[PDB]
Structures are given as structure tokens and as C-alpha cells.
Amino acid sequence: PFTLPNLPLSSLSNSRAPLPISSMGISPDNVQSVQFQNGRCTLDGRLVGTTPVSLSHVAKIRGTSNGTVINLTELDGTPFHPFEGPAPIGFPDLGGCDWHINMTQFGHSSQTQYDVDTTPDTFVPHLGSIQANGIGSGNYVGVLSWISPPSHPSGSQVDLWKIPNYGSIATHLAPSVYPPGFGEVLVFFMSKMPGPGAYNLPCLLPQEYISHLASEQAPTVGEAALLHYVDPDTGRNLGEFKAYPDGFLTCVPNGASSGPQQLPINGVFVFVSWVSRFYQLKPV
Amino acid sequence: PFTLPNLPLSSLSNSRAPLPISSMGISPDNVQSVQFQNGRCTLDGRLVGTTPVSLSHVAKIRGTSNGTVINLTELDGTPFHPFEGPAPIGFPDLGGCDWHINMTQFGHSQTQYDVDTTPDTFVPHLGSIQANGIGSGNYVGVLSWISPPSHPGSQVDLWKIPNYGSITEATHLAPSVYPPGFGEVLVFFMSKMPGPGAYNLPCLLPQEYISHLASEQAPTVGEAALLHYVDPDTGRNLGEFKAYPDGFLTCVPNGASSGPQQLPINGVFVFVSWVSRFYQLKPV
Numbered sequence: 001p002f003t004l005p006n007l008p009l010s011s012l013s014n015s016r017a018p019l020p021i022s023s024m025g026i027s028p029d030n031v032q033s034v035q036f037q038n039g040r041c042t043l044d045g046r047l048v049g050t051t052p053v054s055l056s057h058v059a060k061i062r063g064t065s066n067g068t069v070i071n072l073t074e075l076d077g078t079p080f081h082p083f084e085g086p087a088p089i090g091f092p093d094l095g096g097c098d099w100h101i102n103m104t105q106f107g108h109s110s111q112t113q114y115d116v117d118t119t120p121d122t123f124v125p126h127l128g129s130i131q132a133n134g135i136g137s138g139n140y141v142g143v144l145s146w147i148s149p150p151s152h153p154s155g156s157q158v159d160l161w162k163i164p165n166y167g168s169i170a171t172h173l174a175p176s177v178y179p180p181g182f183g184e185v186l187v188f189f190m191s192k193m194p195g196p197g198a199y200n201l202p203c204l205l206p207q208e209y210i211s212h213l214a215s216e217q218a219p220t221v222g223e224a225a226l227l228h229y230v231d232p233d234t235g236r237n238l239g240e241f242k243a244y245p246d247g248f249l250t251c252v253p254n255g256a257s258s259g260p261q262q263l264p265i266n267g268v269f270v271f272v273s274w275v276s277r278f279y280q281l282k283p284v
Numbered sequence: 285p286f287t288l289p290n291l292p293l294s295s296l297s298n299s300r301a302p303l304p305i306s307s308m309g310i311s312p313d314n315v316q317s318v319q320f321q322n323g324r325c326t327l328d329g330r331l332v333g334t335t336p337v338s339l340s341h342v343a344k345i346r347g348t349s350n351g352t353v354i355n356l357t358e359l360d361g362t363p364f365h366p367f368e369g370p371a372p373i374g375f376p377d378l379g380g381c382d383w384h385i386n387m388t389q390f391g392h393s394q395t396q397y398d399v400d401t402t403p404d405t406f407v408p409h410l411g412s413i414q415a416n417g418i419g420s421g422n423y424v425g426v427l428s429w430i431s432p433p434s435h436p437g438s439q440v441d442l443w444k445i446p447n448y449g450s451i452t453e454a455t456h457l458a459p460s461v462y463p464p465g466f467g468e469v470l471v472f473f474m475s476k477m478p479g480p481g482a483y484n485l486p487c488l489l490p491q492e493y494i495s496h497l498a499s500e501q502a503p504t505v506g507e508a509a510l511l512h513y514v515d516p517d518t519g520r521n522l523g524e525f526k527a528y529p530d531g532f533l534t535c536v537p538n539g540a541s542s543g544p545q546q547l548p549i550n551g552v553f554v555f556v557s558w559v560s561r562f563y564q565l566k567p568v
């Protein structure tokens with residue numbers, strides 16, 4: 001029926017950058033809902049936001065610099081239009097930080113580091129343009145390399161739970177994700193992101209979970225999916241979790257000892273059955 | 285019951301580099317066999333060579349440099365040992381060319397690592413490669429672009445693999461893949477690779493196929509699976525293919541100028557049924 005990848009978490013990838021998943025976590029005290037644009041897929045198999053099927057499209061950009069601006073296109077080279085979304089499919093969605101994209105060219109040698117500040121009004125990927133920060137004329141394909149603290153919210157710290165400013169504060173943003181409540185906490189898959197700090201990138205689903213869900217457009221019954229996080233070596237059930245139709249998991253923490261982050265990351269999520277949205281999970 | 289990802293080839297990735305698939309093709313006449321180390325998975329879900337589950341490990345290296353050599357570890361940081369294989373999981377497998385990997389660090393603010401896979405200092409199988417000017421420190425690197433081999437006006441031949449050991453030496457490489465004959469030919473998924481030329485990187489299975497077969501762990505009945513490359517738009521069968529146990533596809537080209545090379549990239553492969561190894565395919 002409905003299925004999730006029968007693969008160990010630590011072997012999967014983040015969905016907002018091509019990084020391996022290192023642990024599971026929760027949002028900080030000051031984050032209730034999130035609105036990531038990448039790593040968004042319904043249990044139905046419907047890609048949301050700028051989420052691509054393949055990790056080979058994640059946190060990447062493509063376009064032509066005329067010396068002052070870079071006109072964006074799909075990674076494909078086919079045109080991008082505002083009505084389609086906040087930015088081209090795959091566009092980085094890491095807010096609260098400056099980006100450093102590695103730029104390459106088909107037909108040309110070498111690479112160039114592209115420093116991106118997502119706060120000026122020259123940064124408008126929704127309208128198909130972003131400031132060329134010294135990147136000279138030519139066609140480029142870039143991938144997020146490493147990040148750093150924001151240049152203009154002067155002195156501010158890296159905050160990856162945020163999303164960048166796509167439009168020039170209606171960019172057709174994917175709806176934001178809200179915790180169901182009543183004891184249930186949203187689970188995030190974390191990864192370490194290169195840069196001058198101990199940066200941790202969260203995402204709602206592992207990228208392979210997305211390609212798998214988009215592949216298995218399973219007629220998802222039930223308002224919520226009861227899953228077991230199991231150790232593939234012992235078959236031991238390490239705790240119950242829930243998967244909602246919008247494409248996110250939750251669980252119930254155990255007060256102090258905590259929950260998700262305590263669990264080892266070599267486990268596998270297994271679909272046990274369709275339950276009601278109001279089903280109660282045993283702690284973890 | 286065995287399956288293949290119900291996703292368009294054009295939205296999937298190459299398995300030897302994190303690059304989108306741009307087309308399908310055949311090996312040049314001067315290539316009778318292939319021995320790629322990444323992108324190897326049996327229909328059984330058995331990963332071979334240095335093949336990883338996630339694209340987040342593809343064509344990446346990890347190790348500590350002392351300015352002279354780089355002692356490699358798994359992307360993980362966990363140690364590597366000769367007995368484990370030709371190189372750590374995910375180590376770039378592109379022979380016939382020089383590499384240019386983008387090096388980054390956790391905790392520091394990228395460096396281009398120019399790699400000649402030809403010298404004596406290049407022994408990733410012994411977990412050690414020359415630091416071509418790369419300063420001391422720990423780094424995570426990913427292949428960015430390629431260029432002609434430093435040794436011997438040699439051409440860029442992406443159908444070869446690098447010399448992992450110090451030519452002939454048991455580096456525990458994955459076995460070779462041979463065209464079963466019978467008019468059948470090996471099918472490759474190609475991706476355009478950055479560099480000073482029109483480079484096309486071939487692989488035996490998109491990366492999305494690997495994570496899927498490894499997840500399915502489906503018992504390989506029959507000697508080969510009969511496949512139909514279907515157009516999702518019109519639902520029409522665009523040609524018959526066969527998938528074999530070791531993890532490769534084949535087809536009978538209906539002439540030199542006719543083959544998978546001329547089919548549209550947005551089709552989906554669909555398992556129709558298990559047939560005899562000898563089953564003759566209709567030309568494509």
C-alpha cells in the first residue's frame with residue numbers, strides 16, 4: 001500500500017542542500033511553524049514549492065550574468081516565470097544567512113565563488129533576477145557551497161529555520177507547516193553545513209523520501225500515518241511517529257530525557273497503518 | 285513485486301556525479317566493456333563497488349591534508365581501510381580526465397583541488413592522495429568540473445575509471461559489465477559535465493534508481509526484466525528494453541543512427557514482466 005524508503009536515515013540526504021543526514025531534531029523555542037520551499041512533498045506524491053524530484057536539483061541556480069545582474073532560468077535552461085513560484089525549481093531556500101555558491105560553466109574551465117546577500121532589493125528570484133556580485137558575463141550553473149552570517153541584518157546570526165526574501169515582504173510560497181499540537185512535535189532531519197560556524201540545516205523530509213513519494217503516488221488513505229522507527233538490525237521498535245498528508249512527521253517527547261534527537265540515526269521508518277488524525281502516540 | 289521508479293528520466297540524476305540526466309546513449313565503438321565503481325546496484329538491491337545510497341555521497345571525498353598528502357576517511361569521518369574497497373564510499377570514479385573538486389570545511393569559511401589521477405601519489409585504495417597545494421586541515425570535497433588528463437594530449441574519456449591502487453592491483457573493484465550480445469547493447473544515462481569541453485558523463489543507472497532498488501530489495505526472478513520506456517503524456521510504449529540482474533539495461537538499436545540516443549528524455553521505464561535471458565527485443 002503506502003510505503004516509505006526501506007533505507008537507514010544516516011544514509012539519506014537533506015532536502016534543502018546536498019548534505020548527509022546526521023541526526024533528527026526539533027525546532028527551537030522560537031519556531032512554531034516553518035515554511036521551507038525545498039523538501040516539500042505530500043504523502044500523495046505532490047511536490048510543493050520549489051522542491052525537485054532529484055537531489056541533483058537541490059540548492060542550485062542557473063542563469064546568465066550581464067555583469068550586474070543574473071537572469072535566472074530552470075536548471076534545465078528553459079525559461080522561468082513568476083507565476084510558477086517563488087523562484088526556479090531547486091533554488092536555495094536557506095534564509096537567515098549569506099550564501100556562497102560555486103559557479104561552473106558548460107564549455108569553460110574553472111569555478112568562481114558567488115557571494116549572495118539575500119536582503120537587498122536587487123535580490124528578486126521570484127521576478128527572475130538577482131544581483132551579480134562581481135560574476136562576469138556568461139552562462140552559469142551553481143550549487144550552494146557553504147554559508148555564513150547575514151551581511152545586513154548587521155551582526156545577526158545564522159538562522160536556517162528561515163526562508164529568504166524571494167520577491168521585491170505574493171511570491172506563491174508553499175504553505176507553511178504547523179505542528180498538529182496536543183503533545184505532538186514536528187520532527188526535522190538535520191545535516192551539517194560547511195561554513196565559519198557549527199551550522200545545522202533542518203528539513204521536513206529526506207530527499208530520497210521525496211523521490212520515493214513522488215514515485216509512489218499512493219492513494220493515501222487515513223488522515224494520518226502511524227509509523228514505527230525501527231532498528232534494521234534488531235527489528236526493534238524504537239518509538240511511534242506520525243506522518244501527515246502535508247508531508248511531515250511528528251512524535252511525542254518524554255519531557256526531559258527528550259525525544260527525536262536522543263534516537264540513533266541508523267533507524268528506518270516503517271509504515272504500520274492508517275490511523276485517525278487524533279490518534280495518540282506512546283512517548284519516545 | 286519488482287518495480288522501477290515511476291519518474292521521468294529528465295528529472296533524475298546521474299550516479300557518478302550530482303548532475304541531472306540530459307539523455308540516453310550508447311558507448312563508443314572503441315568501448316567493449318565498462319567497469320564504473322559508482323552507480324552499481326543489482327536489481328536485487330545490492331550496492332556494488334563504491335556506490336552509495338544517496339547522491340549526497342556521490343563524487344565526494346573526505347580527508348585530512350598536511351599540505352603534502354590527504355589521508356582519506358569515509359564522508360562520515362569514520363576510517364577507511366584497503367579491504368573495504370577501491371576507495372571510500374562515493375569517491376569519484378571518472379577515469380580519463382583530471383578532476384577539480386570544490387573543497388569546503390566545517391567551521392571555516394572554498395578551495396579548488398586540482399587532481400591528476402595518474403601519478404604514484406594517487407592511491408585512494410590506500411586511503412592517500414597528493415595534496416596539490418591544499419593547505420593543512422580537514423576538508424569535504426565534491427567534484428565540480430573536469431578537464432583533459434594531465435598525462436599522457438590524451439582525450440577526455442569518461443568511460444574509464446581511475447587507477448585506485450599503484451594498473452594491475454587487487455583494489456577490490458566491482459566486476460565489469462559486458463554487452464550480452466544477441467544484438468543487444470548497453471544503455472547509459474548521460475549528464476552534461478562542466479569543463480572546457482562538451483563533456484557527457486555516462487552511468488548505468490540514475491541515482492534515484494539505486495536508492496529505489498536498494499529500498500525495494502525485491503527478489504530477482506527471471507534472467508531479465510522486460511521493460512517499456514513509456515511516454516507519460518500519451519501513455520504510449522516508446523520501445524522495448526531489458527533489465528538484467530547485475531544492474532544494467534540493454535536494447536537492440538535499429539541501425540547505427542538509431543538507438544536510445546534518439547528517444548525523448550522525459551519517458552519512464554516500466555517493468556512489464558520477467559522473461560528469459562534469451563528473449564529477443566524489438567529494435568528501438
Ligand SMILES: CC(=O)N[C@H]1[C@@H](O[C@@H]2[C@@H](O)[C@@H](CO)O[C@@H](O)[C@@H]2O[C@@H]2O[C@@H](C)[C@@H](O)[C@@H](O)[C@@H]2O)O[C@H](CO)[C@H](O)[C@@H]1O
Pocket residue numbers: 098099115148149150151152393
Ligand atoms: C567572503 C566572506 O567570507 N564573506 C562573509 C564575511 O564578511 C566579509 C569577509 O571578507 C570579512 C573578512 O574579515 O570581512 C567582512 O567585512 C566582509 O563583509 C562582506 O564584504 C564586505 C566588503 C561588505 O560587502 C559586507 O557587507 C559583506 O558582508 O562575513 C560576513 C559577516 O561578517 C558575511 O558572512 C560575508 O558573507
Ligand SMILES: CC(=O)N[C@H]1[C@@H](O[C@H]2[C@@H](O)[C@@H](CO)O[C@@H](O)[C@@H]2O[C@@H]2O[C@@H](C)[C@@H](O)[C@@H](O)[C@@H]2O)O[C@H](CO)[C@H](O)[C@@H]1O
Pocket residue numbers: 109110382383398399400431432433434435
Ligand atoms: C586549473 C586548470 O585549468 N588545470 C588544467 C590545466 O592545467 C594546465 C593549464 O592550467 C596551463 C595553462 O597555461 O598551465 C599548466 O601549468 C597546467 O598544467 C597542469 O600542471 C602542470 C604542472 C602539469 O602537471 C599538467 O599536467 C597539469 O595539467 O590543463 C591541464 C591539461 O592540459 C589539466 O586539464 C589541468 O587540470
